[PDB]
């Protein structure tokens, strides 16, 4: 165990029932979140009456608040403090929160703007590919004229996400179903973490200029660079994140190599609903000869 990394999940990990009793435990944070958002965060999470959890403008605030509350529960009960922080796209906001870069309300405000803009993207899609390398994927996409489709998530060596125009993502299905290679269409109307997000990114960077973001008090591994957020480049890193691939595998691997250089062991604590990142980290570690 030894050095501890707190990690926060993103889109896809949400599920009706998430949060639970944490909402009333943190009754004041919860009321702060309803006032920022203009609806009940607890209702959206526990009950989900309009089946809203899967639409990105709601998914994102849901994740953030659940990740945060789980993080506060963990801090209080366990007593532990992170030596390192990383979050997966949305989850990066909770990493920056735990590094003291903004307060709870301010992150939620950033998230709501992020989530609103990303929701405006029409005509894109994403699909997760299992058991092809990056090189197989990129070649295959080239060979079949999927010109606007690229890697959006590099999650583990055998698990990557693509995004592009909906029809390209649709045509890809046929290209990634064979031998071990598998394909899964995801839920979204946006080609997230690709060039289609550029307008959201710029709109989001502009919104960010209204907020004074502190340098991290605990290292946060940035999705864009797979390296620690620089002092002074927080808003920079945060904004670039949106149109860039999420370099999850490399971020984890950077932590594994850092622990080793320091002769220390390293563990990963997933803070939020589900075990999505827990399973990614096991797979990464199993690969990555040691």
UniProtKB/TrEMBL annotation:
<dbReference type="GO" id="GO:0005829">
    <property type="term" value="C:cytosol"/>
</dbReference>
<keyword id="KW-0012">Acyltransferase</keyword>
<dbReference type="GO" id="GO:0004314">
    <property type="term" value="F:[acyl-carrier-protein] S-malonyltransferase activity"/>
</dbReference>
<keyword id="KW-0808">Transferase</keyword>
<protein>
    <recommendedName>
        <fullName>[acyl-carrier-protein] S-malonyltransferase</fullName>
        <ecNumber>2.3.1.39</ecNumber>
    </recommendedName>
</protein>
<dbReference type="GO" id="GO:0006633">
    <property type="term" value="P:fatty acid biosynthetic process"/>
</dbReference>
<feature type="domain" description="Malonyl-CoA:ACP transacylase (MAT)">
    <location>
        <begin position="7"/>
        <end position="290"/>
    </location>
</feature>
